[PDB]
Amino acid sequence: VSPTRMNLLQRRGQLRLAQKGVDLLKKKRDALVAEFFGLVREAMEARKALDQAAKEAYAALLLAQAFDGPEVVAGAALGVPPLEGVEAEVENVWGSKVPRLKATFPDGALLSPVGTPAYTLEASRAFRRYAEALIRVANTETRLKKIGEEIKKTT
Amino acid sequence: MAVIADPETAQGFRLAGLEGYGASSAEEAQSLLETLVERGGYALVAVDEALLPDPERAVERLMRGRDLPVLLPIAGLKEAFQGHDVEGYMRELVRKTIGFDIKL
Amino acid sequence: SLSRLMNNGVGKGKTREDHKQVSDQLYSAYANGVDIRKLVAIIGEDALTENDRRYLQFADAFERFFINQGQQNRSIEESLQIAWALLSMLPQGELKRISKDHIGKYYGQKLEEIWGAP
Amino acid sequence: PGGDMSEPVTQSTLRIVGAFWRLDASLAFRRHFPAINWNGSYSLFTSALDPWYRENVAEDYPELRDAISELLQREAGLQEIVQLVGPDALQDAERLVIEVGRIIREDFLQQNAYHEVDAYCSMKKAYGIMKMILAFYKEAEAAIKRGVSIDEILQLPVLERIGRARYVSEEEFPAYFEEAMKEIQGAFKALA
Amino acid sequence: PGGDMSEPVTQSTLRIVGAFWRLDASLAFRRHFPAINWNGSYSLFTSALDPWYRENVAEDYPELRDAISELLQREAGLQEIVQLVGPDALQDAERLVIEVGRIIREDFLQQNAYHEVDAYCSMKKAYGIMKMILAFYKEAEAAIKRGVSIDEILQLPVLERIGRARYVSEEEFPAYFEEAMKEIQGAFKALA
């Protein structure tokens, strides 16, 4: 750049703009950290809710295996179709899109939906609640793992 | 969606509708996970904490090409009954995310 | 803008007794509002807190009414009345620069009585 | 000499003239003539000429001119952030201002001195173009609040209609303006 | 005029002076007076005055002063972590040293000149205040590892006695000094 007074004024204007940009980016980083410190608490709560859900699902599954025997469960379990209506939508978070997961399989599609075996029905009930509660943990963690990289980029 | 865990709870997840698989060692779980990853389809995989503490480390190069697949660590059968405190997971995750490791 | 001899001409027995603290509060609130107005362009109005939105509206109301006076002739009492009418947009308790006695005497007047002829 | 505005002749002239049309070399490089630097230009005759404009052009012409200048100022303000974090980090309400400023710069301010029609422009033609631009902006500002994303608004065919109103002849303009005004209204009501 | 100390008169003065009491405008905005920047100021007369200090004021004065300066230096090293995360999320010992630095600043470095009795301070008063501050800091640091009422340490009634020594008369100073020291003893030794 050739040394002139006009160039000197232009360079000082550039310096002022850079300082203002730094001051604005620090506020953006502070806001991101403020959101992060609540998202981490939500993830922590969901993680310990999933523990109890998993434990009371496993207890029911073990009791169904023990008392009713493997054959009562396997009367339907040998031909259970898997879940296939998996939702793969996206949702924006601070200029980036993250997915949310959901399934839409019906209830009575499997063979013999009647609850004649009590423990086999209770295991499916607890596992259904488990599956419906897992998506909270999934969504909260995948949002947290992206806020954590937005903060890093800003820094 | 699929899950890799102990064989007893794996068939329970199969009853619940997930393509569960039984395993008890890290190598077979990692091999089956990377076998499931390569094909397009379901992007959600759940692994017990006794098989793969870091699911991203196994597919770290496939994840660099696409961050879409979701891998979620989870508690095992024996881990659930003995229980734990989930604060250690948060304490590790804060170091993983912001590095300062400190969270009172 | 700045005046260095300001503190000697204001107070009790000359103009009104609440002048200096009102000026300081207006300065600080405008200083917050102008920065929030540029943070909005990045993060949007949805991610703000409620008091930040109060400041964002206060800055626009300030520029609309206190500065843009046109060819009007305002006495000091009218200017102080408008200054207190702008500060009533902010909730009581955020006014850290003003004593409780002055707030208990001048806060709360609506801007609607001057809204008909700004 | 060397484009230095601190030259004694320039500063001597700057203190006695009523209008000042500063030119830019950067705009002349990219062939954006007349290359008037809007930031560094001023005119002191704006206020005294208002009674003539109301009588001879239109009753609301100064309001349209002030709206255009305000939009240009807002666009100039936002360009500090685009240099910092890129244009894709802005919200839709600011992307709309950026695109409207670009439309104004490319369509209204730009003029060709060697073209058959674009060389001369009367006052009412400029008034019509300003009215069309402001009508489009007011439609888009309300359409944003209906949840419509900006990246599909810019694909409307009426963008080409506005951008080529320069080359319309003076006697053909009163029909082109009335057709484009109805097209603006018809384009946005069926958007979403 | 430029704010920076590269101004030619300042550069010429800096080479022939022993003490350099830089002021800062930002500390004036916080209304902390005097506005001395303790990170930029320096003095070259400490070592020569040290033999006078220990033979007249107290034998433990230089070490106590160095402890105060070291504690002020430690708190300045944590200002980065406060900028990312809130002070509440910081560690208990880090919060302890931050609160000790805040107490040291607001009750030792503050002297209002317009105020009638805040404008003067002797040497014995300063020595007593530093001694009380160091005793409180050491006992609270031990009591944190004691593991009882670790959050209620920050609200002990001793902190009132620390602030009370700022305004005690010189003639009444030894009695309040004994009161504060024995209050520190009766609090930290016998609370739990």
PDB file of C-alpha atoms in Angstrom, chain D:
ATOM      1  CA  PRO D   1      -2.582  13.498  -7.813  1.00  0.00           C
ATOM      2  CA  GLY D   2      -2.759   9.802  -7.027  1.00  0.00           C
ATOM      3  CA  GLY D   3      -6.376  10.093  -5.947  1.00  0.00           C
ATOM      4  CA  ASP D   4      -5.399  11.708  -2.631  1.00  0.00           C
ATOM      5  CA  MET D   5      -8.349  13.743  -1.368  1.00  0.00           C
ATOM      6  CA  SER D   6      -6.148  15.601   1.146  1.00  0.00           C
ATOM      7  CA  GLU D   7      -4.690  17.608  -1.751  1.00  0.00           C
ATOM      8  CA  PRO D   8      -4.848  21.387  -1.071  1.00  0.00           C
ATOM      9  CA  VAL D   9      -6.990  22.002  -4.171  1.00  0.00           C
ATOM     10  CA  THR D  10      -9.601  19.457  -3.067  1.00  0.00           C
ATOM     11  CA  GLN D  11      -9.769  20.861   0.466  1.00  0.00           C
ATOM     12  CA  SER D  12      -9.959  24.406  -0.904  1.00  0.00           C
ATOM     13  CA  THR D  13     -12.871  23.407  -3.149  1.00  0.00           C
ATOM     14  CA  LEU D  14     -14.623  21.395  -0.423  1.00  0.00           C
ATOM     15  CA  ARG D  15     -15.267  24.457   1.745  1.00  0.00           C
ATOM     16  CA  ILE D  16     -17.133  26.635  -0.783  1.00  0.00           C
ATOM     17  CA  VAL D  17     -19.246  24.262  -2.900  1.00  0.00           C
ATOM     18  CA  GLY D  18     -22.845  23.278  -2.216  1.00  0.00           C
ATOM     19  CA  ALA D  19     -22.663  19.816  -3.790  1.00  0.00           C
ATOM     20  CA  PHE D  20     -19.900  17.215  -3.792  1.00  0.00           C
ATOM     21  CA  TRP D  21     -19.853  14.143  -6.053  1.00  0.00           C
ATOM     22  CA  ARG D  22     -16.897  11.997  -5.003  1.00  0.00           C
ATOM     23  CA  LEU D  23     -15.887   9.258  -7.442  1.00  0.00           C
ATOM     24  CA  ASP D  24     -14.458   5.827  -6.634  1.00  0.00           C
ATOM     25  CA  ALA D  25     -11.716   3.963  -8.482  1.00  0.00           C
ATOM     26  CA  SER D  26     -12.842   0.562  -7.175  1.00  0.00           C
ATOM     27  CA  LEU D  27     -16.312   0.963  -8.691  1.00  0.00           C
ATOM     28  CA  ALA D  28     -14.752   2.164 -11.948  1.00  0.00           C
ATOM     29  CA  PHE D  29     -12.531  -0.930 -12.087  1.00  0.00           C
ATOM     30  CA  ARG D  30     -15.544  -3.272 -12.071  1.00  0.00           C
ATOM     31  CA  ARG D  31     -17.263  -1.072 -14.687  1.00  0.00           C
ATOM     32  CA  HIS D  32     -19.991   0.056 -12.286  1.00  0.00           C
ATOM     33  CA  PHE D  33     -20.468   3.506 -13.746  1.00  0.00           C
ATOM     34  CA  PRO D  34     -21.244   6.357 -12.907  1.00  0.00           C
ATOM     35  CA  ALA D  35     -19.127   5.092  -9.938  1.00  0.00           C
ATOM     36  CA  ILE D  36     -20.376   7.691  -7.450  1.00  0.00           C
ATOM     37  CA  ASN D  37     -19.242   6.919  -3.905  1.00  0.00           C
ATOM     38  CA  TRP D  38     -22.501   7.192  -1.970  1.00  0.00           C
ATOM     39  CA  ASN D  39     -20.777   7.209   1.425  1.00  0.00           C
ATOM     40  CA  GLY D  40     -18.559  10.199   0.657  1.00  0.00           C
ATOM     41  CA  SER D  41     -20.980  12.367  -1.329  1.00  0.00           C
ATOM     42  CA  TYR D  42     -23.354  15.029  -0.037  1.00  0.00           C
ATOM     43  CA  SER D  43     -25.658  17.786  -1.242  1.00  0.00           C
ATOM     44  CA  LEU D  44     -26.858  20.825   0.692  1.00  0.00           C
ATOM     45  CA  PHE D  45     -29.759  21.670  -1.652  1.00  0.00           C
ATOM     46  CA  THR D  46     -32.021  18.785  -0.579  1.00  0.00           C
ATOM     47  CA  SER D  47     -34.197  20.772   1.827  1.00  0.00           C
ATOM     48  CA  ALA D  48     -34.728  23.905  -0.276  1.00  0.00           C
ATOM     49  CA  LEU D  49     -35.915  21.947  -3.331  1.00  0.00           C
ATOM     50  CA  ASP D  50     -38.688  20.035  -1.518  1.00  0.00           C
ATOM     51  CA  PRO D  51     -41.580  22.439  -2.408  1.00  0.00           C
ATOM     52  CA  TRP D  52     -40.776  22.115  -6.119  1.00  0.00           C
ATOM     53  CA  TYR D  53     -40.733  18.305  -6.028  1.00  0.00           C
ATOM     54  CA  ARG D  54     -44.123  18.136  -4.302  1.00  0.00           C
ATOM     55  CA  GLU D  55     -45.743  20.388  -6.904  1.00  0.00           C
ATOM     56  CA  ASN D  56     -44.051  19.095 -10.057  1.00  0.00           C
ATOM     57  CA  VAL D  57     -43.313  15.379  -9.581  1.00  0.00           C
ATOM     58  CA  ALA D  58     -45.419  13.824  -6.817  1.00  0.00           C
ATOM     59  CA  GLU D  59     -46.729  14.710  -3.377  1.00  0.00           C
ATOM     60  CA  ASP D  60     -44.806  11.911  -1.616  1.00  0.00           C
ATOM     61  CA  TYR D  61     -41.492  12.007  -3.526  1.00  0.00           C
ATOM     62  CA  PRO D  62     -39.340  13.228  -0.562  1.00  0.00           C
ATOM     63  CA  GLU D  63     -40.645  10.355   1.576  1.00  0.00           C
ATOM     64  CA  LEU D  64     -39.634   7.825  -1.090  1.00  0.00           C
ATOM     65  CA  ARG D  65     -36.202   9.454  -1.403  1.00  0.00           C
ATOM     66  CA  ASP D  66     -35.722   9.340   2.373  1.00  0.00           C
ATOM     67  CA  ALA D  67     -36.789   5.681   2.443  1.00  0.00           C
ATOM     68  CA  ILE D  68     -34.244   4.831  -0.268  1.00  0.00           C
ATOM     69  CA  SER D  69     -31.477   6.678   1.595  1.00  0.00           C
ATOM     70  CA  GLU D  70     -32.449   4.949   4.854  1.00  0.00           C
ATOM     71  CA  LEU D  71     -32.310   1.544   3.152  1.00  0.00           C
ATOM     72  CA  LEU D  72     -28.867   2.359   1.740  1.00  0.00           C
ATOM     73  CA  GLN D  73     -27.674   3.427   5.203  1.00  0.00           C
ATOM     74  CA  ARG D  74     -28.980   0.192   6.739  1.00  0.00           C
ATOM     75  CA  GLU D  75     -27.249  -1.849   4.032  1.00  0.00           C
ATOM     76  CA  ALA D  76     -24.012   0.050   4.679  1.00  0.00           C
ATOM     77  CA  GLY D  77     -24.334  -0.722   8.387  1.00  0.00           C
ATOM     78  CA  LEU D  78     -24.757  -4.463   7.893  1.00  0.00           C
ATOM     79  CA  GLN D  79     -21.667  -4.781   5.677  1.00  0.00           C
ATOM     80  CA  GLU D  80     -19.462  -4.534   8.774  1.00  0.00           C
ATOM     81  CA  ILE D  81     -20.773  -7.937   9.890  1.00  0.00           C
ATOM     82  CA  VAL D  82     -20.497  -9.625   6.479  1.00  0.00           C
ATOM     83  CA  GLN D  83     -16.777  -8.841   6.396  1.00  0.00           C
ATOM     84  CA  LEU D  84     -16.524 -10.439   9.846  1.00  0.00           C
ATOM     85  CA  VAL D  85     -18.504 -13.691   9.562  1.00  0.00           C
ATOM     86  CA  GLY D  86     -19.642 -13.932   5.938  1.00  0.00           C
ATOM     87  CA  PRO D  87     -23.075 -13.328   4.420  1.00  0.00           C
ATOM     88  CA  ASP D  88     -24.525 -16.704   5.467  1.00  0.00           C
ATOM     89  CA  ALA D  89     -24.396 -15.890   9.198  1.00  0.00           C
ATOM     90  CA  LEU D  90     -27.172 -13.282   8.997  1.00  0.00           C
ATOM     91  CA  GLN D  91     -30.866 -13.683   9.721  1.00  0.00           C
ATOM     92  CA  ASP D  92     -33.480 -13.471   6.976  1.00  0.00           C
ATOM     93  CA  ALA D  93     -34.484  -9.924   7.946  1.00  0.00           C
ATOM     94  CA  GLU D  94     -30.893  -8.834   7.257  1.00  0.00           C
ATOM     95  CA  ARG D  95     -30.373 -10.995   4.171  1.00  0.00           C
ATOM     96  CA  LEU D  96     -33.439  -9.246   2.745  1.00  0.00           C
ATOM     97  CA  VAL D  97     -31.852  -5.842   3.393  1.00  0.00           C
ATOM     98  CA  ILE D  98     -28.604  -7.011   1.765  1.00  0.00           C
ATOM     99  CA  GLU D  99     -30.415  -8.275  -1.341  1.00  0.00           C
ATOM    100  CA  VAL D 100     -32.602  -5.158  -1.600  1.00  0.00           C
ATOM    101  CA  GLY D 101     -29.509  -2.961  -1.365  1.00  0.00           C
ATOM    102  CA  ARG D 102     -27.853  -5.012  -4.100  1.00  0.00           C
ATOM    103  CA  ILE D 103     -30.984  -4.688  -6.264  1.00  0.00           C
ATOM    104  CA  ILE D 104     -31.037  -0.911  -5.737  1.00  0.00           C
ATOM    105  CA  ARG D 105     -27.337  -0.599  -6.577  1.00  0.00           C
ATOM    106  CA  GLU D 106     -27.540  -2.750  -9.713  1.00  0.00           C
ATOM    107  CA  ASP D 107     -30.853  -1.420 -11.044  1.00  0.00           C
ATOM    108  CA  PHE D 108     -31.504   2.142  -9.868  1.00  0.00           C
ATOM    109  CA  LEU D 109     -28.067   3.727  -9.421  1.00  0.00           C
ATOM    110  CA  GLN D 110     -26.321   2.060 -12.372  1.00  0.00           C
ATOM    111  CA  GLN D 111     -26.735   3.939 -15.653  1.00  0.00           C
ATOM    112  CA  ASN D 112     -25.268   3.478 -19.140  1.00  0.00           C
ATOM    113  CA  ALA D 113     -24.257   6.692 -20.905  1.00  0.00           C
ATOM    114  CA  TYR D 114     -23.756   5.109 -24.348  1.00  0.00           C
ATOM    115  CA  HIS D 115     -26.987   3.101 -24.459  1.00  0.00           C
ATOM    116  CA  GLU D 116     -29.818   4.084 -26.788  1.00  0.00           C
ATOM    117  CA  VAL D 117     -32.406   4.523 -24.008  1.00  0.00           C
ATOM    118  CA  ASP D 118     -30.481   4.401 -20.718  1.00  0.00           C
ATOM    119  CA  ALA D 119     -28.588   7.642 -21.437  1.00  0.00           C
ATOM    120  CA  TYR D 120     -31.495   9.914 -20.441  1.00  0.00           C
ATOM    121  CA  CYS D 121     -33.963   9.396 -17.604  1.00  0.00           C
ATOM    122  CA  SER D 122     -36.772  11.766 -16.667  1.00  0.00           C
ATOM    123  CA  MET D 123     -37.969  12.409 -13.130  1.00  0.00           C
ATOM    124  CA  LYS D 124     -41.194  10.384 -13.267  1.00  0.00           C
ATOM    125  CA  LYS D 125     -39.344   7.316 -14.557  1.00  0.00           C
ATOM    126  CA  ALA D 126     -37.042   7.426 -11.523  1.00  0.00           C
ATOM    127  CA  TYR D 127     -40.085   7.938  -9.295  1.00  0.00           C
ATOM    128  CA  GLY D 128     -41.733   4.863 -10.804  1.00  0.00           C
ATOM    129  CA  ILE D 129     -38.618   2.729 -10.366  1.00  0.00           C
ATOM    130  CA  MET D 130     -38.269   3.828  -6.729  1.00  0.00           C
ATOM    131  CA  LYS D 131     -41.951   3.066  -6.117  1.00  0.00           C
ATOM    132  CA  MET D 132     -41.563  -0.407  -7.652  1.00  0.00           C
ATOM    133  CA  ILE D 133     -38.506  -1.177  -5.510  1.00  0.00           C
ATOM    134  CA  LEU D 134     -40.217  -0.004  -2.322  1.00  0.00           C
ATOM    135  CA  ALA D 135     -43.369  -1.987  -3.159  1.00  0.00           C
ATOM    136  CA  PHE D 136     -41.273  -5.128  -3.658  1.00  0.00           C
ATOM    137  CA  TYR D 137     -39.474  -4.525  -0.360  1.00  0.00           C
ATOM    138  CA  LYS D 138     -42.745  -3.992   1.514  1.00  0.00           C
ATOM    139  CA  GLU D 139     -44.182  -7.195   0.035  1.00  0.00           C
ATOM    140  CA  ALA D 140     -41.078  -9.203   0.941  1.00  0.00           C
ATOM    141  CA  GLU D 141     -40.872  -7.797   4.479  1.00  0.00           C
ATOM    142  CA  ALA D 142     -44.396  -9.050   5.205  1.00  0.00           C
ATOM    143  CA  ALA D 143     -43.802 -12.348   3.386  1.00  0.00           C
ATOM    144  CA  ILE D 144     -40.804 -13.039   5.641  1.00  0.00           C
ATOM    145  CA  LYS D 145     -43.062 -12.882   8.712  1.00  0.00           C
ATOM    146  CA  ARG D 146     -45.226 -15.632   7.191  1.00  0.00           C
ATOM    147  CA  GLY D 147     -42.329 -18.077   7.601  1.00  0.00           C
ATOM    148  CA  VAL D 148     -41.251 -17.907   3.954  1.00  0.00           C
ATOM    149  CA  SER D 149     -37.506 -18.311   3.512  1.00  0.00           C
ATOM    150  CA  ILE D 150     -35.652 -15.674   1.512  1.00  0.00           C
ATOM    151  CA  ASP D 151     -33.816 -18.092  -0.805  1.00  0.00           C
ATOM    152  CA  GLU D 152     -37.068 -18.834  -2.670  1.00  0.00           C
ATOM    153  CA  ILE D 153     -38.299 -15.219  -2.731  1.00  0.00           C
ATOM    154  CA  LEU D 154     -35.306 -14.109  -4.827  1.00  0.00           C
ATOM    155  CA  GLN D 155     -36.198 -16.717  -7.475  1.00  0.00           C
ATOM    156  CA  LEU D 156     -39.448 -14.948  -8.379  1.00  0.00           C
ATOM    157  CA  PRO D 157     -39.720 -13.908 -12.057  1.00  0.00           C
ATOM    158  CA  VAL D 158     -40.565 -10.328 -11.033  1.00  0.00           C
ATOM    159  CA  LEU D 159     -36.886  -9.818 -10.160  1.00  0.00           C
ATOM    160  CA  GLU D 160     -36.039  -9.756 -13.872  1.00  0.00           C
ATOM    161  CA  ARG D 161     -39.018  -7.448 -14.442  1.00  0.00           C
ATOM    162  CA  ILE D 162     -37.637  -4.826 -12.042  1.00  0.00           C
ATOM    163  CA  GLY D 163     -34.026  -5.204 -13.167  1.00  0.00           C
ATOM    164  CA  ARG D 164     -34.785  -4.411 -16.817  1.00  0.00           C
ATOM    165  CA  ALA D 165     -37.043  -1.385 -16.312  1.00  0.00           C
ATOM    166  CA  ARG D 166     -34.028   0.789 -17.165  1.00  0.00           C
ATOM    167  CA  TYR D 167     -34.119   0.011 -20.883  1.00  0.00           C
ATOM    168  CA  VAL D 168     -37.855   0.648 -21.313  1.00  0.00           C
ATOM    169  CA  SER D 169     -38.496   3.702 -23.473  1.00  0.00           C
ATOM    170  CA  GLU D 170     -39.956   6.856 -21.948  1.00  0.00           C
ATOM    171  CA  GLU D 171     -43.289   6.633 -23.788  1.00  0.00           C
ATOM    172  CA  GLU D 172     -43.659   2.891 -23.108  1.00  0.00           C
ATOM    173  CA  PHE D 173     -42.950   3.260 -19.384  1.00  0.00           C
ATOM    174  CA  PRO D 174     -46.497   4.226 -18.187  1.00  0.00           C
ATOM    175  CA  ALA D 175     -47.781   0.819 -19.337  1.00  0.00           C
ATOM    176  CA  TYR D 176     -44.763  -1.164 -18.124  1.00  0.00           C
ATOM    177  CA  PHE D 177     -45.022   0.400 -14.659  1.00  0.00           C
ATOM    178  CA  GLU D 178     -48.720  -0.420 -14.313  1.00  0.00           C
ATOM    179  CA  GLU D 179     -48.158  -3.997 -15.470  1.00  0.00           C
ATOM    180  CA  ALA D 180     -45.197  -4.543 -13.131  1.00  0.00           C
ATOM    181  CA  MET D 181     -47.131  -3.083 -10.192  1.00  0.00           C
ATOM    182  CA  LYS D 182     -49.935  -5.618 -10.682  1.00  0.00           C
ATOM    183  CA  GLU D 183     -47.383  -8.407 -11.179  1.00  0.00           C
ATOM    184  CA  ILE D 184     -45.788  -7.488  -7.829  1.00  0.00           C
ATOM    185  CA  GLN D 185     -49.140  -7.856  -6.061  1.00  0.00           C
ATOM    186  CA  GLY D 186     -50.015 -11.080  -7.872  1.00  0.00           C
ATOM    187  CA  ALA D 187     -46.630 -12.691  -7.253  1.00  0.00           C
ATOM    188  CA  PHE D 188     -46.640 -12.578  -3.455  1.00  0.00           C
ATOM    189  CA  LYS D 189     -50.237 -13.530  -2.600  1.00  0.00           C
ATOM    190  CA  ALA D 190     -49.731 -16.967  -4.182  1.00  0.00           C
ATOM    191  CA  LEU D 191     -46.248 -17.408  -2.678  1.00  0.00           C
ATOM    192  CA  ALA D 192     -47.396 -19.292   0.432  1.00  0.00           C
TER     193      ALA D 192
END
